[PDB]
Each structure stands twice: as C-alpha cells, then as structure tokens.
Amino acid sequence: DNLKKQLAVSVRNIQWSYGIFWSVSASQPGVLEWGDGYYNGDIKTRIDQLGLERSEQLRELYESLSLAALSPEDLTDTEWYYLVCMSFVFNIGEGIPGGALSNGEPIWLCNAETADSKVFTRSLLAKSASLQTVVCFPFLGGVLEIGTTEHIKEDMNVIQSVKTLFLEA
Amino acid sequence: DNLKKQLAVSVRNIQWSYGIFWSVSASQPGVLEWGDGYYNGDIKTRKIDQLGLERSEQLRELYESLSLAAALSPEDLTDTEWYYLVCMSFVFNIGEGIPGGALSNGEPIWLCNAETADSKVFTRSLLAKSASLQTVVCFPFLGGVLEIGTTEHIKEDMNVIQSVKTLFLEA
Numbered sequence: 001d002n003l004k005k006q007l008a009v010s011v012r013n014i015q016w017s018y019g020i021f022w023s024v025s026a027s028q029p030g031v032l033e034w035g036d037g038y039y040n041g042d043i044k045t046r047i048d049q050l051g052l053e054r055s056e057q058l059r060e061l062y063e064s065l066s067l068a069a070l071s072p073e074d075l076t077d078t079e080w081y082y083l084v085c086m087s088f089v090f091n092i093g094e095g096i097p098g099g100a101l102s103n104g105e106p107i108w109l110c111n112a113e114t115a116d117s118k119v120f121t122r123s124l125l126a127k128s129a130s131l132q133t134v135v136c137f138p139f140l141g142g143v144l145e146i147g148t149t150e151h152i153k154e155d156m157n158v159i160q161s162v163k164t165l166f167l168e169a
Numbered sequence: 170d171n172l173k174k175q176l177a178v179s180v181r182n183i184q185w186s187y188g189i190f191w192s193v194s195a196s197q198p199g200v201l202e203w204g205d206g207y208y209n210g211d212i213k214t215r216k217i218d219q220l221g222l223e224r225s226e227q228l229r230e231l232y233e234s235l236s237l238a239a240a241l242s243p244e245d246l247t248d249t250e251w252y253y254l255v256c257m258s259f260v261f262n263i264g265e266g267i268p269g270g271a272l273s274n275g276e277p278i279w280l281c282n283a284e285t286a287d288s289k290v291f292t293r294s295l296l297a298k299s300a301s302l303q304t305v306v307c308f309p310f311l312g313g314v315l316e317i318g319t320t321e322h323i324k325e326d327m328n329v330i331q332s333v334k335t336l337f338l339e340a
C-alpha cells in the first residue's frame with residue numbers, strides 16, 4: 001500500500017514516539033521487512049498537515065546510507081533507532097514483529113530497554129533511544145509496531161485505539 | 170587473524186583519513202566484504218594504545234550494535250566517522266564499484282574529486298561528499314583490495330601506493 005498518512009494520524013493521536021508497518025515480503029512468505037513508518041519523536045536540527053517531512057527525510061538519508069537533505073550528525077539517538085529499523089528483516093517466529101506474526105496476537109514490551117535479546121533483538125538500540133515501551137501486533141496482513149519513550153502498562157485499548165484511528169484516517 | 174596494526178601504521182604514516190582492507194568472502198568467490206579498517210579522521214567527543222586503535226575499535230562496536238566502557242552513541246559521530254562506519258555494511262561483486270573494479274582490473278583506481286565521481290564508477294560518491302572526502306584510492310593487495318581516502322585533494326601518485334604497501338608489510 002501507501003500507509004504514511006494512516007501511520008501519522010494514529011501515532012500522533014496516541015502521542016507515542018514512532019510507528020512502523022512491517023509488511024510480508026512479496027518474494028519470501030513469512031519474512032517481514034520495513035513497509036512504512038512515521039517518526040513522532042524529538043529532533044535537534046531543522047501544507048504538511050501531518051508533519052510527514054522529517055519521516056520522508058529520515059527515509060531519504062537511510063536510502064543514501066544504504067546505497068533540505070539531512071546528514072548523519074543532524075539526527076538524535078531516537079531518530080537513529082527509527083532509521084536503522086529500516087534495514088531489519090524478521091523471519092516468522094523471529095523477534096517481536098516475527099513473534100507477533102506467528103502468535104497472531106500482541107507482544108507488549110514494558111522496560112523494552114531490559115528485554116532479553118532473544119525476545120527483543122533491539123533492546124540496546126531501544127536503550128540508547130530512551131525507548132521504554134514497544135508494542136507489536138498483527139494488522140492488515142502484516143505487523144504494526146508502536147513505541148514510546150514513556151512507560152505505559154499493557155493497555156489493549158491503545159491497540160484498539162490505533163487500529164480504529166488507522167482505519168478511519 | 171587481523172590487519173588492524175598494519176592499517177594503523179600505514180594510514181597514520183601517509184596522514185590520510187582512513188584505510189579499509191576489503192577481503193574476499195570465504196563462502197562466495199569474487200565477492201569483497203569489509204575485512205578490517207583504521208579511522209584516522211576528525212572526532213567531536215573525547216594499557217598503552219601506541220597506534221590510537223581505540224576509536225576504530227569503538228566505531229566497529231557501534232556498527233555491530235546498529236546491525237544486530239566508553240561505548241559510542243550515534244550522536245557522538247562526525248560525518249566522516251559515519252562514512253567509515255557505513256562502509257562496514259558494503260559488499261562488492263568482482264567488477265562492482267571501485268573495490269570490485271580494482272580486484273577485477275588487478276590495478277589501482279585513483280579517484281580525485283571522489284565526491285563528483287559517476288555513481289556507476291564510485292557507488293559512495295555522495296557519502297564521500299557528506300564526509301568531505303576528496304581523494305579515494307583502491308588497489309589489489311594481499312589477495313584482497315586496500316582502500317585509502319583523505320579529505321585532501323592529492324593528484325595521482327603511485328609512490329603513495331608504494332609507501333603504503335611497504336609501510337604495511339614492514340609494520
């Protein structure tokens with residue numbers, strides 16, 4: 001699809017730090033890759049109703065590193081978490097996105113920064129980005145991930161609220 | 170084992186910004202991958218470390234964390250350090266880019282104004298531009314490819330390649 005506006009409305013509404021849609025590979029069944037995202041976090045360096053520009057710029061920088069443009073020194077540590085997630089690919093069963101696809105239900109990580117590296121492969125990247133809460137759930141034939149620098153106890157109403165905001169955007 | 174001390178002596182001696190040894194994949198004939206490097210460029214942060222290996226070891230540690238005691242965070246790096254770090258991800262087919270070109274041709278490729286090089290010759294010309302790297306040189310060496318680059322404009326000088334190989338083997 002193109003999911004950019006849906007991701008933006010839903011992340012900005014719940015006021016979390018970022019969202020990613022992990023989509024199933026066209027070529028490799030049961031392999032998740034980066035589909036699209038929205039970055040809603042802090043920046044240190046500077047009609048777009050939904051503030052898509054910084055997300056489009058982080059994407060452009062990722063594409064140039066992986067072979068008003070941003071340079072690497074412009075990013076916060078939270079922006080680097082967002083950008084390096086674009087490189088990640090998950091086998092069904094693998095990590096929190098692969099886990100959520102296989103299990104067919106949410107994985108809600110509180111204290112994500114301390115999660116076992118075999119449950120959450122990104123726990124140390126989360127720690128450097130001050131990301132505390134990370135949530136993955138099956139949605140639209142892929143996996144929707146949201147994370148925040150805030151500590152939020154497991155609340156299935158947040159997931160319901162994102163799916164609804166997403167589908168009505 | 171490793172080339173870290175050899176790379177350090179030779180890059181620090183010629184006073185260039187960095188060196189990389191691209192080594193042929195054990196698994197894939199004619200594919201180059203990152204073997205080892207030495208970063209000799211600017212920084213913005215701050216047992217005897219004679220050759221200043223620590224920052225190179227820290228840039229490697231940060232790369233391994235990004236690809237899944239004084240560890241670096243991404244915000245700590247200069248734009249030249251980012252060139253050095255993202256090179257660790259790159260893989261080249263024989264014939265492909267300047268390292269693959271150097272392996273295939275069996276001789277040096279000396280890029281001046283590397284920031285303006287055609288992207289089919291030098292895949293990294295825009296990364297070079299963001300890192301203020303002007304001169305990039307690859308040549309076959311030890312069954313792989315040695316790459317050196319600098320923020321300076323240095324016209325083609327095969328005596329630089331001779332001095333690096335000699336410094337490298339006498340290190």
Ligand SMILES: [Cl-]
Pocket residue numbers: 221
């Ligand atoms: Cl020094």
Ligand SMILES: [Cl-]
Pocket residue numbers: 265266267268290291292293
């Ligand atoms: Cl290249």
Ligand SMILES: [Cl-]
Pocket residue numbers: 280281282283303304321322323
């Ligand atoms: Cl030059």
Ligand code: NA
Pocket residue numbers: 094095096097119120121122
């Ligand atoms: Na994970």
